[PDB]
Design a binder for this molecule. Structure first.
Ligand SMILES: CCCCCCCCCCCCCCCCCC(=O)OC[C@H](COP(=O)([O-])OCC(O)COP(=O)([O-])OC[C@@H](COC(=O)CCCCCCCCCCCCCCCCC)OC(=O)CCCCCCCCCCCCCCCCC)OC(=O)CCCCCCCCCCCCCCCCC
Ligand SMILES: CCCCCCCCCCCCCCCCCC(=O)OC[C@H](COP(=O)([O-])OCC(O)COP(=O)([O-])OC[C@@H](COC(=O)CCCCCCCCCCCCCCCCC)OC(=O)CCCCCCCCCCCCCCCCC)OC(=O)CCCCCCCCCCCCCCCCC
Ligand SMILES: CCCCCCCCCCCCCCCCCC(=O)O[C@@H](COC(=O)CCCCCCCCCCCCCCC)COP(=O)(O)OCC[N+](C)(C)C
Ligand SMILES: CCCCCCCCCCCCCCCCCC(=O)O[C@@H](COC(=O)CCCCCCCCCCCCCCC)COP(=O)(O)OC[C@H](O)CO
Ligand SMILES: CCCCCCCCCCCCCCCCCCCC(=O)O[C@H](COC(=O)CCCCCCCCCCCCCC)COP(=O)(O)OCCN
Ligand SMILES: CCCCCCCCCCCCCCCCCCCC(=O)O[C@H](COC(=O)CCCCCCCCCCCCCC)COP(=O)(O)OCCN
Ligand SMILES: CCCCCCCCCCCCCCCCCCCC(=O)O[C@H](COC(=O)CCCCCCCCCCCCCC)COP(=O)(O)OCCN
Ligand SMILES: CCCCCCCCCCCCCCCCCCCC(=O)O[C@H](COC(=O)CCCCCCCCCCCCCC)COP(=O)(O)OCCN
Ligand SMILES: CCCCCCCCCCCCCCCCCC(=O)OC[C@H](COP(=O)(O)O)OC(=O)CCCCCCCCCCCCCCCCC
Ligand SMILES: CCCCCCCCCCCCCCCCCC(=O)OC[C@H](COP(=O)(O)O)OC(=O)CCCCCCCCCCCCCCCCC
Ligand SMILES: COC1=C(OC)C(=O)C(C/C=C(\C)CC/C=C(\C)CC/C=C(\C)CC/C=C(\C)CCC=C(C)C)=C(C)C1=O
Lengths: 387, 134, 54, 64, 116, 286, 105, 76, 157
């Protein structure tokens, strides 16, 4: 009986109808597609199950779709969402491989498609490098899956070959020293895909890790590499895109410290606060709120980034992971300097914000002003909330 | 290939079977059912024949050196090649369906597969990508 | 030249077809030797545990 | 026309004689007029068992 | 060693998603068809289908009016949300018929000769 | 015995290719109210043999600006693939024989593209891509036709296959439009009329050129045997001659398409028709 | 000490291991173009596909064949997209680079 | 995922099911603690898979056969 | 079994040869030889249909796209530092260590395995693909859809 699979049939039927509707709308010469975007958001809601993580991903992708305008980009983001959703439910390396590869192909094509102006060739260059680096990591995953399949005779993810699969997962999160594909991507690709790349796949992969993964090894050297390299790199790079790429490497090192000491509640709290800050960061038009992102990414006390860092520090001290904790505290002391550089650049400066001329007047002030109210979330964060 | 174990020889003992297998004639109704071995021999023999065709006019033909005798007298192909690649993969997927006595849920799964195929194809038709004006 | 390249390819194919099976044979011989050492050590441990284990 | 008839007759005769000769040669190789049939795993198992048991019958015959 | 003689004409009866439950309610029909699923559907399911269709019509009219294409957008969005709701309702009815959900209303209506 | 069987197969293939190219000349002449070759031997029966021997003692032109290996390899690859495909027709018992021949004929594209890469002509590079585009475009309709054919091919034990000896010995009346599409696809693969616009062998002389034409006519005979097996209830000498006569008859009476015209035909007419027929036959076969 | 089947199996596994590392390393080591890098990625995929098919025969199991079909699909899609991007980048940067498709120079 | 390539199931599927049944019937709060009590079934499943111990026995018999022919070459 | 083992070992030689040569055309020719030889290797294991899929997809379709791209984009620069710059000794050392000596093999502690031919059943494959792995089949279709749309969007205008 197939009566337990109506959501899958609904997914496929919705894709079949959406392609035909997008074709009919384009035969009329419509230069805007807000109706297509609303149908895409409805389809996103209709295929998502009733778990916390699934709906967090769903609501995140509904918010992200407001920064994309063409039909093909919307289709690629939907088919990347299918991989992102179904990776959280993957209990093998077969589905794991297919979901990861679908996401990689969608990201590569979007990086090629959306570039404009003088930065087109730089974006295509960085997309090619990302594709080549992704191909060999995919080959490593397939090779060691074949080794595990031959040794165990089954699809269980146990044994020594899980160390290389773990390295595949660490590549997909931009963990140093395999971090330079993300550093290349941050310097050229436009802001909407940078917003997409810093939020949704990290959530999808960490939920797969929380749900169906065990390894008998450690990730401590990659924690050290990510934290020290990210902090020193963001201290040393004057371009703002490289600053935010290296600060992202530092944040993924903190999330790996939360993974390594168990306690995924602190991981989920810090990831949620980080995702809301990212949603504020890449949609800013008034540059004074760039200082709020700075004080809430430096871990300064009353804002929500402090709470996200401080439960990670608390659980690390609870299980006595002293050396990694000391390295994390040193890199936190270093991170403050370049977040202060951000504050010097964009707060202690005269205010200029250009008006719109061709309509759409400051079109994402709702989301940015809503996400700035991360100064009111700390009242709920101090309680036993995320567990 | 020859069998290397008593279990592979149906537990027949002796030395007559080993020599008889190593010096057997090729037989589709003996030990070589569905074998694809004549395809290799055909390649070797035809390569020999075409090499003899290539070499022979270098001996039995006249030749004169001249500097003028040894001289010369779009993106649609990208579309065709990539579309052919994807459609060939899809037909290769459809081939295990046609080689089975399929039940009704197999039929409806296959039709969902074909529907996704033809939906992408019809989108590229409607956007004017199969009109080869350029 | 064409004849030189065809001769070099034929030489490389024949040399690869004769040389690599010796590498594989040496590797398999090393694995057999280490496995026999492991079997003998296991038998020694079993005899020791029978001796002081009753 | 009448000039096109000899080549068209010769093509048929060539293919008839060649297929007859190839049939006789492959019939001498295989000794049964169903060698080209499709065979699944059960039929392959049956033929391989038959071959090995024929070899065993030959081995046991040269002992009496 | 000797394999089983294959049955080429018999395909396994298998759906790709397996429920891993036994039903905890009486089983009326272990395998209902689409007619069986629609003819034993409750009124709340039809209500949520009509609510989804109405919301789809109104929202499609709003979004399709920005490109002056409001009526076909409203019709398409209504059908899209309505078929989502209809698949949900048919699945709920089939699960009640198979015994995986509460079916006290369905047992007293689907067995005319096995009423009491 | 396998080498003997293969050589006994190879002999009538080459003899038949010579007689096909003569019969094409003479039938094309008879439609045009003339005679065709009659002088060269009695009833012109030595003309292909003297063409072959004339090309044998012809000077081989090796251009000293090309890559000699690929230039030599292109007609050898074409000829070898034609002979191997004939062996797959007659000296095989494989389960997926039609898939084997489809795979071999998909390899035949390489001789055209190696000739296009090797020779340093401006328009050889221009025409090789067009010829490859035509062959590539019609291969998909051939594959979907094979999908429709294989839905009804079952052997005695109940297994579905593409084995030629298990095909029925009656004409497939239910698949007449698919048979017509198959025949026009054969015409498109062999670059005949009405698809003969693209040539690629403009720099080849003597026996390399002879290898090109022997490969072309042998591939035509392969596709004729395949069509007679799939649709006409078996492989026979009369069916080979009748289908060859039909191809020459079409070449006598029709003009050719432009490049974009047969591209639109193959990508907007033949592929959707074969896929729709596959869906209908799958619905019937349940 | 060992049989002909064991020689055949160990030779297969040694061959595929050297194939995998050849595809991973060699075109980068010889400082080749992006087109040859994509070809070597196809070599990596072929090594994994052969390993899966060997294991599927070895265990009498279906999962290797499913993985084989999936690997062919994903590898061809990624390769086609990469070649399209290579052509686009070459046409964007050939006016000032000449050797634009070689990033290992 | 345990389906056979030419048969209904794989050749060592039932050994795997024996091991998983043992793991199912234990009550320890950790998988690593439950694994210590089902090591015999895991060993039999590994012996089904690769036959390392049968190969080891054959290697030992071959070592003794090579020893009884070099050190012992006794003529009649 | 000399020719079968030699045909198995030839695949690694062709894998090295793809990157070793300086001509891109010759690299593609080596790849075509490798895929044909590997399709014949897969048929030693008993796979008839999947070997034909290997041939039909990789040699028939993908290598044609490779040869079109190479022939459209490669003006001869083999002298232009493709010969004059050589190769990387560190990369060659990595290849030797990992693929010749094989310090981290896929079989791990095992060093000997018995190769066993299979008997491919396409009825079993059809049953598996269209009943047991049907969700993976549909997601493969979605990946092919991504490829088709993405190529047609990325085609240089
Ligand atoms: C069955 C499922 C039905 C559909 C559900 C998913 C689709 C949601 C899409 C949506 O709300 O469309 C916005 C759309 C407004 O877009 P618009 O006015 O055409 O665009 C104006 C500009 O965007 C400029 O205007 P703006 O940026 O100020 O407003 C953008 C928009 C939304 O702006 C945002 O994305 C920011 C809002 C942040 C709140 C996020 C909530 C998540 C909280 C998590 C709690 C758990 O504004 C709203 O807040 C509208 C909310 C209406 C109800 C949503 C339910 O809302 C509607 O028209 C109503 C949609 C509700 C259902 C019909
Ligand atoms: C689907 C496609 C169609 C194919 C299917 C059709 C069915 C088969 C029909 C047969 C084909 C008919 C025509 C054959 C061509 C005749 C030769 C010719 O015209 O010159 C070639 C000619 C040589 O190039 P070139 O124009 O002189 O130079 C231009 C380059 O820029 C120059 O490049 P380069 O200088 O960089 O390359 C030099 C290279 C030149 O390579 C060649 O000469 C071509 C190689 C393949 C051609 C095979 C034909 C016969 C050659 C002799 C085979 C002997 C092998 C052993 C046989 C037993 C004899 C004792 O020679 C070498 O030095 C090789 C070095 C070896 C690798 C080194 C790396 C590893 C080092 C590690 C340690 C070393 C130990 O061009 C080609 O390679 C054309 C490729 C087309 C060949 C057919 C493709 C398929 C082959 C059969 C299937 C594969 C199955 C495997 C079985 C055995 C392997 C073959
Ligand atoms: C690669 C270089 C060529 C290797 C050639 C080779 O291996 O030769 C084979 C294959 O080559 C040949 O036999 C043909 C030689 C080609 C030249 C013939 C020209 C035409 C006359 C030997 O065949 P036999 O062992 O004698 O045949 C085995 C028995 N059975 C007939 C059943 C197949
Ligand atoms: C414009 C869109 C409108 C859509 C809504 C209206 C259209 C109707 C919806 C389609 C039909 C109803 C939904 C499916 C009904 C299944 C219930 C059932 O049992 O029906 C048959 C079930 O057969 C099917 O048709 C099964 C459909 C299989 C679909 C397989 C694909 C599922 C989706 C996979 C997607 C993968 C996920 C992608 C993302 C990772 C057989 O009925 P029976 O068991 O009573 O008959 C017995 C007889 O002997 C035959 O079994
Ligand atoms: C107002 C915001 C601005 C508007 C814009 C909206 C942005 C889009 C939506 C937000 C995107 C960020 C969300 C990130 C994911 C966080 C939630 C992951 C789930 C999680 O933490 O775990 C569950 C706790 O849920 C919880 O209750 C977690 C609490 C919330 C965490 C986030 C903290 C920052 C706010 C426990 O799961 P369980 O125990 O039930 O699971 C067992 C069955 N598998
Ligand atoms: C680093 C941050 C602190 C900065 C000043 C550190 C000064 C050195 C500590 C002196 C402690 C006194 C002392 O020697 O007693 C020790 C008591 O052990 C202990 O309990 C050692 C605790 C000392 C470190 C506590 C500081 C932690 C602050 C937070 C660090 C960040 C998170 C953790 C990595 C061992 O006595 P002995 O060996 O001399 O006796 C000899 C006879 N056996
Ligand atoms: C297997 C069978 C394969 C059949 C292939 C069918 C190809 C369909 C492509 C049709 C594209 C041509 C086109 O513009 O179609 C429009 C809508 O067609 C459609 O929307 C037809 C969709 C058919 C889906 C199947 C006609 O209407 P329009 O939008 O051009 O008219 C208002 C603007 N003048
Ligand atoms: C000195 C050392 C030389 C080493 C050469 C190694 C590579 C060998 C390449 C083929 C050599 C041909 C002659 C060798 C005999 C042969 O066919 O060997 C077979 C091994 O398969 C193979 O060798 C498979 C390779 C086949 C590649 C040829 C590709 C043809 C392409 C044409 C398209 C085909 C389309 C698909 C059907 C099995 O021989 P056996 O033990 O059974 O023989 C005797 C029992 N009767
Ligand atoms: C100030 C911060 C306000 C954030 C609001 C937190 C609300 C959490 C509700 C969770 C719940 O009731 O579960 C519903 C439900 C689980 O209960 P069920 O309805 O029984 O399945 O799951 C969800 O829908 C989770 C919603 C997650 C929203 C994104 C994560 C936070 C942003
Ligand atoms: C034409 C456009 C493409 C059509 C195919 C696209 C979708 C592929 C088919 C998915 C089929 C899902 C199960 C269908 C089923 O069980 O129908 C039997 C079912 C049996 O009839 P009953 O007697 O009412 O149960 O047929 C139907 O009632 C539905 C008619 C088929 C419609 C297929 C497409 C659905 C959306 C439109
Ligand atoms: C309008 O279409 C046509 C063309 O344009 C496409 C042509 O170009 C040609 C001319 C080209 C020809 C005939 C070349 C192709 C055929 C050949 C080489 C014949 C092959 C025959 C063989 C191998 C058998 C002959 C050899 C024998 C009998 C061996 C002899 C040995 C001894 C005596 C010891 C023709 C006739 C033609 O109609």
């Amino acid at each position: 009986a197939a009566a337990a699979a109506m959501i899958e049939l609904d997914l496929c039927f919705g894709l079949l109808l959406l392609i035909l509707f997008g074709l009919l709308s384009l035969r009329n010469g419509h230069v805007s597609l807000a109706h297509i975007r609303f149908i895409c958001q409805c389809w996103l809601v209709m295929i998502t199950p009733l778990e916390v993580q699934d709906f967090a991903l769903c609501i995140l992708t509904v918010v992200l779709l407001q920064s994309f305008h063409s039909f093909e980009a919307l289709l690629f983001l939907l088919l990347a969402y299918i991989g992102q959703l179904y990776m959280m439910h993957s209990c093998n390396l077969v589905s794991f491989y297919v979901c990861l590869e679908a996401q990689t192909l969608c990201v590569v094509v979007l990086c090629g498609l959306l570039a404009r102006g003088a930065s087109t060739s730089f974006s295509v260059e960085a997309a090619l490098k990302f594709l080549l680096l992704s191909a060999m990591v995919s080959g490593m995953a397939l090779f060691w899956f074949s080794a595990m399949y031959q040794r165990t005779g089954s699809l269980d993810m146990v044994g020594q070959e899980t160390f290389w699969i773990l390295l595949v997962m660490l590549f997909k999160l931009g963990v140093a020293p395999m971090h330079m594909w993300s550093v290349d991507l941050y310097g050229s690709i436009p802001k909407s895909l940078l917003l997409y790349l810093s939020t949704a796949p990290k959530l999808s992969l960490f939920t797969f890790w929380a749900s169906s993964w065990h390894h008998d090894f450690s990730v401590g050297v990659f924690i050290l590499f990510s934290m020290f390299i990210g902090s020193i790199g963001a201290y040393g790079q004057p371009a703002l895109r490289s600053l935010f790429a290296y600060s992202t490497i530092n944040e993924i090192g903190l999330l790996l410290l939360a993974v390594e000491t168990a306690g995924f509640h602190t991981l989920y709290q810090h990831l949620g606060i980080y995702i809301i800050t990212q949603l504020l960061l890449w949609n800013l038009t008034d540059k004074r709120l760039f200082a709020l992102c700075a004080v809430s990414l430096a871990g300064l006390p009353p804002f929500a980034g402090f709470f996200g860092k401080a439960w990670i520090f608390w659980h690390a001290m609870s299980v006595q992971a002293f050396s990694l904790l000391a390295a994390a505290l040193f890199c936190t002391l270093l991170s403050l300097v370049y977040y202060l550089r951000v504050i010097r650049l964009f707060w202690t400066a005269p205010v200029h914000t250009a008006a719109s001329f061709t309509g759409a007047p400051n079109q994402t002030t709702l989301t940015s002003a809503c996400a700035v109210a991360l100064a009111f979330a700390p009242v709920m964060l101090v309680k036993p909330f995320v567990i | 290939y020859n069998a290397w174990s008593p279990a592979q020889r149906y537990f027949v003992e002796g030395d007559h079977v080993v020599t008889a297998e190593a010096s057997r004639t090729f037989q589709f109704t003996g030990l070589d059912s569905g074998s694809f071995y004549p395809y290799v021999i055909a390649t070797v023999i035809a390569t020999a024949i075409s090499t003899v065709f290539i070499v022979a006019p270098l001996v039995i033909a006249p030749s004169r050196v001249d500097l003028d005798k040894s001289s010369a007298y779009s993106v649609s192909f990208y579309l065709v090649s990539i579309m052919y690649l994807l459609f060939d993969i899809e037909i290769a997927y459809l081939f295990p369906y046609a080689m089975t006595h399929a039940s009704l849920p197999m039929y409806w799964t296959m039709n969902l597969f074909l529907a996704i195929l033809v939906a992408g194809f019809a989108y590229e038709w409607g956007m004017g990508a199969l009109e080869w004006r350029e | 030249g064409l004849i030189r390249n065809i001769a070099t390819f034929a030489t490389a194919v024949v040399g690869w077809s004769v040389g690599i099976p010796f590498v594989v044979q040496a590797r398999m011989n090393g694995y057999v030797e280490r496995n026999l050492a492991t079997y003998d050590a296991a038998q020694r441990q079993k005899a020791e545990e029978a001796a002081i284990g009753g | 026309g009448w000039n096109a008839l000899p080549s068209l007759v010769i093509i048929t005769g060539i293919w008839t004689a060649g297929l007859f000769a190839l049939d006789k040669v492959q019939m001498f190789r295989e000794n049964k007029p169903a060698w080209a049939n499709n065979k699944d795993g059960w039929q392959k198992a049956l033929y391989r068992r038959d071959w090995y048991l024929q070899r065993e019958e030959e081995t046991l015959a040269m002992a009496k | 060693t000797w394999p089983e003689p294959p049955n080429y004409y018999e395909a396994p009866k298998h759906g790709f998603k397996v429920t891993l439950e036994n039903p905890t309610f009486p089983i009326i029909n272990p395998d209902p068809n689409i007619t069986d699923a629609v003819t034993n559907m409750r009124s709340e399911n039809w209500g949520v289908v009509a609510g989804l269709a109405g919301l789809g019509y109104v929202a499609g009219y709003y979004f399709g009016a920005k490109v002056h294409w409001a009526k076909p957008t409203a019709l398409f969005t209504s059908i899209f949300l309505g078929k989502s709701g209809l698949l949900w309702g048919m699945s709920d009815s089939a699960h009640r018929l198979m015994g995986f959900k509460e079916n006290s209303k369905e047992v007293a209506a689907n067995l005319p000769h096995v009423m009491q | 015995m396998i080498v003997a069987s293969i050589l006994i197969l190879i002999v009538p293939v080459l003899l038949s290719v010579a007689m096909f190219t003569l019969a094409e000349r003479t039938v094309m002449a008879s439609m045009q109210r003339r005679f065709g070759p009659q002088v060269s031997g009695i009833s012109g029966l030595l003309q292909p043999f003297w063409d072959g021997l004339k090309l044998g003692v012809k000077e081989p032109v090796l251009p000293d600006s090309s890559s000699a290996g690929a230039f030599a390899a292109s007609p050898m690859i074409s000829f070898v693939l034609s002979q191997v495909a004939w062996v797959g027709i007659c000296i095989s018992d494989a389960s997926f024989q039609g898939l084997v021949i489809m795979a071999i004929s998909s390899l035949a594209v390489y001789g055209v593209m190696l000739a296009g890469w090797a020779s340093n002509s401006k328009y050889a590079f221009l025409g090789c891509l067009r010829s490859v585009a035509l062959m590539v475009s019609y291969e998909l309709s051939l594959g979907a036709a094979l999908l429709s054919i294989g839905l009804f091919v079952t052997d005695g034990t109940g297994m579905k296959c593409l084995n030629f000896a298990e095909m029925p010995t009656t004409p497939q009346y239910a698949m007449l439009p698919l048979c017509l599409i198959f025949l026009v696809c054969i015409l498109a693969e062999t670059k005949r009329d009405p698809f003969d616009l693209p040539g690629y062998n403009v720099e080849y002389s003597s026996l390399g050129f002879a290898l090109f034409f022997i490969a072309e006519y042998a591939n035509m005979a392969v596709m004729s045997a395949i069509a007679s097996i799939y649709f006409l209830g078996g492989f026979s000498a009369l069916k080979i001659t009748a289908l060859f006569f039909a191809f020459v008859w079409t070449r006598g009476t029709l003009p050719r398409y432009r490049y974009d015209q047969f591209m639109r035909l193959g990508w907007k007419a033949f592929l959707p028709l074969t896929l729709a027929f596959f869906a209908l036959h799958a619905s019937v076969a349940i | 000490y060992y049989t002909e089947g064991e020689i055949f199996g160990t030779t297969f596994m040694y061959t595929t291991n050297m194939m995998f590392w050849a595809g991973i390393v060699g075109a980068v080591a010889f400082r080749r173009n992006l087109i040859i890098l994509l070809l070597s990625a196809e070599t990596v995929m072929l090594a994994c596909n052969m390993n899966f098919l060997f294991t599927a025969a070895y265990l009498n199991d279906i999962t290797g064949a499913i993985m084989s079909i999936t690997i062919t699909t994903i590898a061809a899609c990624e390769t086609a997209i990469g070649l399209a991007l290579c052509v686009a980048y070459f046409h964007m940067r050939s006016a000032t680079d000449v050797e634009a498709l070689n990033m290992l120079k | 995922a345990g389906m056979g390539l030419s048969t209904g199931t794989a050749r060592c599927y039932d050994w795997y099911m024996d091991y998983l049944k043992c793991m199912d019937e234990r009550k320890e709060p950790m998988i690593a603690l439950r694994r210590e009590h089902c090591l015999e079934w895991l060993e039999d499943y590994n012996e089904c898979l690769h036959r390392e111990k049968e190969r080891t026995r054959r290697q030992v018999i071959e070592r003794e056969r090579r020893a009884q022919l070099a050190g012992g070459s006794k003529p009649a | 079994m000399f020719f079968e083992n030699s045909a198995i070992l030839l695949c690694a030689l062709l894998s090295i040869a793809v990157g070793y040569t300086k001509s891109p055309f010759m690299s593609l020719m080596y790849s075509v030889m490798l895929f044909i030889n590997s399709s014949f290797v897969l048929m030693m294991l008993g796979f008839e249909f999947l070997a034909l899929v290997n041939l039909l997809v990789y040699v028939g379709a993908l290598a044609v796209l490779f040869l079109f791209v190479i022939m459209l984009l490669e003006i001869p620069a083999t002298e232009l530092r493709a010969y004059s710059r050589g190769w990387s000794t560190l990369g060659i050392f990595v290849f030797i260590i990992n693929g010749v000596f094989q310090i981290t093999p896929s079989m791990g502690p095992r060093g000997i395995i018995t190769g066993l031919p299979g008997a491919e059943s396409i009825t079993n494959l059809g049953h598996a693909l269209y009943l047991y792995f049907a969700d993976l089949l549909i997601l493969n279709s979605l990946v092919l859809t991504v490829a088709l749309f993405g190529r047609f969007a990325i085609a240089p205008v």
